[PDB]
């Protein structure tokens, strides 16, 4: 299991809403193209976010994860998954949510 | 028939979205409990303005009418409902949608 | 894989020799009780300290890692290596090395 946390952002760049959710190691829920036809991890959490944070639009935000230097990376593809949890040694995989 | 035109106010007090749906000249939609509860023209209005705007809260907004100093009055009453089509002598009942 | 920092602590709690090594993320190197007869993660930690710190005795030192208060708990036993794994949430297990 891999807790995430998402840190919401107004106008201010300001700590808005504050939710975590329980996410899990393995690549994908589903393997059928019924299920996964395509993406998995970014498809998933970005579903996680809409729902925990209603205060913006369902799937109208981007999600900006820090990188080896530090600077916002608006990550929206599965591919980019695996290379932001290699990143946290640690199972917390925290995020910068932006309304667009 | 009467048309009611709402108008979106975001931070500048500036048009967002503009949208419009025809109302019944008639007092309630519905007569019994099951369907009327008190509320109907206001709690009707209401409904409509959300599903109409959903860029906010579903019922997390107030909506001002002008009256005859042109003040905004935020309404949310059958009986202050009755008083604002008082004001409009056409068949168009204008009024300011604004989320809290 | 996991790596493990070790800092050796002369007199004065001051760092004198750095050093770390790969360890597998496995219970155990081996099963039968001729290369596992009770223990396995904390006798091969201890086995590489003493060999990559020839500083002091090779079986003659205490190996303290901080808890979730930070103070200094020498541990030597498998079932504390487990529970010491637990707090570093990355790849890096840092333990502060003192000869006895």
Chains 1, 2, 3 share one sequence.
Do not use: N, W
Not at 4 to 14: F, I, P, Q
Not at 19 to 43: K, L, Q, V
């Amino acid at each position: 299991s891999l807790t995430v946390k998402a840190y919401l952002l107004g106008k201010e760049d300001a700590a808005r809403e504050i939710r975590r959710f329980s996410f899990c190691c393995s690549p994908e829920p589903e393997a059928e193209a019924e299920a996964a036809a395509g993406p998995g991890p970014c498809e998933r959490l970005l579903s996680r976010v809409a729902a925990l944070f209603p205060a913006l639009r369902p799937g109208g935000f981007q999600a900006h994860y820090r990188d080896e230097d530090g600077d916002l990376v608006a990550f929206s593809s599965d591919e980019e998954l695996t290379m932001a949890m290699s990143y946290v040694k640690d199972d917390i995989f925290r995020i910068y949510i932006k309304e667009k």
